[PDB]
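Researcher: We're teaching a course module on how sequence relates to structure. For the next exercise, students receive a sequence and then see the predicted structure as tokens, so they can try to spot secondary structure elements on their own. Here is the exercise chain.
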Amino acid sequence: PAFEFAVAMMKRNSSTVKTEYGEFTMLGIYDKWAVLPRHAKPGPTILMNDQEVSVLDAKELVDKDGTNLELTLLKLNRNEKFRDIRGFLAKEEVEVNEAVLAINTSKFPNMYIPVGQVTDYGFLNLGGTPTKRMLMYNFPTRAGQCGGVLMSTGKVLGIHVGGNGHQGFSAALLKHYFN
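Model: And here is the predicted structure for the students to work with:
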């Protein structure tokens, strides 16, 4: 049932974004607020589904010590509101036995990957940057999956932010980031 959930979530709330740093999946959360991996480094405008969109505000998330969470929240200059999905976000990191990672890019158009068990992995030195609140799964290979959305039935768990060739890692998407 997690696939059907995932498909509906991507159709309603996801888009493809290009920055000067690459092409990513982007997830809208509520109102005009969306999330990207921090390494996407959006500038004053982005390409969203090939359309130039101005960014009104951006926030690189850190914990109370200033430690990296690998998430950027961005507020978009567009008329339409995102369907509010804050009810699908947990208050704390979620472990599950079965999850689905969903990707929306030119390179990976509308793809769904069963990744299996998700663990609350904790700290990771990601790209030289100590990073917290990582969710880990078995995941061959790499490339253009960043921004992919990690889900289980009725839950949005996290955003895919990197990998080591064998394991993948998502930044947990927690309720308190969004009010």
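Model: If you want an answer key for the exercise: The two ends are 29 Å apart (CA to CA). The domain at 2-9+85-178 is CATH 2.40.10.10 (Thrombin, subunit H).
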